[PDB]
Amino acid sequence: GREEFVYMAKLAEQAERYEEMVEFMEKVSAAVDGDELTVEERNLLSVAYKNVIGARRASWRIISSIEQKEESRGNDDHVTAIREYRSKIETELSGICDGILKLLDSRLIPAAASGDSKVFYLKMKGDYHRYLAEFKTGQERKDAAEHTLAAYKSAQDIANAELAPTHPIRLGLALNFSVFYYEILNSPDRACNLAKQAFDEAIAELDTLGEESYKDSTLIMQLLRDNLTLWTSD
Template identity: 75%
Template sequence: LDQELTIEERNLLSVAYKNVIGARRASWRIVSSIEQKEEAKGNESQLGQIKAYRDKIEAELAKICEDILEVLDGHLIKSAESGESKVFYHKMKGDYHRYLAEFATGDKRAVSSDASLEAYKAASSIATVELPPTHPIRLGLALNFSVFYYEILNAPDKACQLAKQAFDDAIAELDTLSEESYKDSTLIMQLLRDNLTLWT
């Protein structure tokens, strides 16, 4: 694992983990929402079971995040050579610390949130230098980093500023859009715009 993955291998790894984590994040949201409703009703008898199930999902989420973060820190980030790979893996690191911060509380949440912020910042500083504003990985980073500001740091102004900047920068350089990434890039630009509409 200490040699650079091919683009295909990198994408397969990312999609595999995204699928595994995505299902559990969705379950966690549903169970948390049920828990809040039962709490509001004062339905004590159900709450124990619901909480136990939520704890089980959280343990699975934590394990998946810790596994991929270990691979990223132990191998992938170290062996990344191209600017694109470095951005990809730092962004991924930011994403999985963000997923930990979504359900963590207290000190654990603060630690995950800080680690996520650092990883996103590292990815951004490389992306700004190495990738054009229309590059799907740079746009995807801006999308996820802005969601982090909005959802985890409760900083809607910063989230909007980041998303708007990424969108405007990409629009200004639409002529650098490569044919093979046209669909990916324009889709992410649309998502950035959707979020801006939602957040303002």
């Protein structure tokens, strides 16, 4: 049942056993055929996959640094061992992304009925194609980068048309889209322009706020500034 698996997902979260949280939410999604996940369920699913992928991304990064350092020292035996270990982490990364992408393409995106949900899931699709682009090479990298740009640019079209410039989902899309430009496409100018644009469009309607609603918007907008601060001084 949907209720039971949501509860198990909350138990896994508390226990920080995120691989099992993914499974419980994977079963929540299966129990919700055609209908949309609740905001709560939608957020639990993303918290479940973010941590799971977050750990492997962390591992992959630290392992890559070690590989390069060992390459600089000439330890071929160490480099060989590191590459096989990195390849194992990359296999997990591929499987984690494939799991959420399979769910996004076949169930979540097709069922999204509001502009809110449409910009959330497409954004998530771009996020996890972006994670693939972080480590893939060759044709698989370009295929992942293009799927990211397609999903982000699509999500952008709906966001500009149906979401306020201060909406957290829209701001999050602009932040991640700008990161995509800087890191994956190595286009710093396009990254800065998008981050500033999304920020300027927000501050224009920011003062038309409540008191406890722009807590989430101010958080994303500060990240946009921080990235701009780093990108502007090289």
